[PDB]
């Protein structure tokens, strides 16, 4: 039921026709520059955000470096180059330098989780947590415990070609 929101998408991203998938293109599309659009960081949000309750979705991930995904607070900064950090309201996993990371700050946390293909995200706004699990055995990857203070959106980022993220039906 989640779909990517094209009005938020950085113009270099290419969204799938069914709005489930995202990869990085080779040029910027000519798109209107709405306040909601990430104009520099290679990000896109889902069209649905959450202010309460518990929510699950699953994300199919490419094998090559370049992606990061999780959740963002609605007030995440959209304009100019911004850090990809929890302080900026991004709580995410990332594949970079051949390693899986939970994107903590100032140092990321390397995950010795083995190869990932699909990840379940469990967002719990009632207790204040977002957790990630590898779907094959639901092994726990990481949990951020956060007193979320605003609406929270699923977040996706792809900053190199050769990889992808896809919301799974």
């Amino acid at each position: 039921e989640l779909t990517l929101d094209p009005d938020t998408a950085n113009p270099r991203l290419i969204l799938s026709l069914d709005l489930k998938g995202v990869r990085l293109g080779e040029r910027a599309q000519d798109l209107p520059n709405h306040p909601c659009r990430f104009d520099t960081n290679t990000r896109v949000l889902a069209s649905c955000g959450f202010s309460s309750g518990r929510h699950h979705w699953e994300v199919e991930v490419g094998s090559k470096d370049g992606w990061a995904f999780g959740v963002a607070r609605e007030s995440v900064r959209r304009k100019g180059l911004t850090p990809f950090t929890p302080e900026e309201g991004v709580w995410a996993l990332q594949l970079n330098g051949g390693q899986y990371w939970a994107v903590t700050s100032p140092e990321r946390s390397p995950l010795s989780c083995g190869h990932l293909s699909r990840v379940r995200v469990a967002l719990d706004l009632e207790v204040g947590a977002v957790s990630f699990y590898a779907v094959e055995d639901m092994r726990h990857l990481y949990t951020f415990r956060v007193n979320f203070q605003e609406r929270v959106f699923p977040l996706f980022s792809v900053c190199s070609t050769g990889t992808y993220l896809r919301i799974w039906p």
Binding site: T42, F84, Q94, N96, S157, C159
Partner: peptide, 7 residues
């Protein structure tokens, strides 16, 4: 590295 600067 630098290649994730725009993440």
């Amino acid at each position: 590295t630098l290649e994730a600067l725009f993440q």
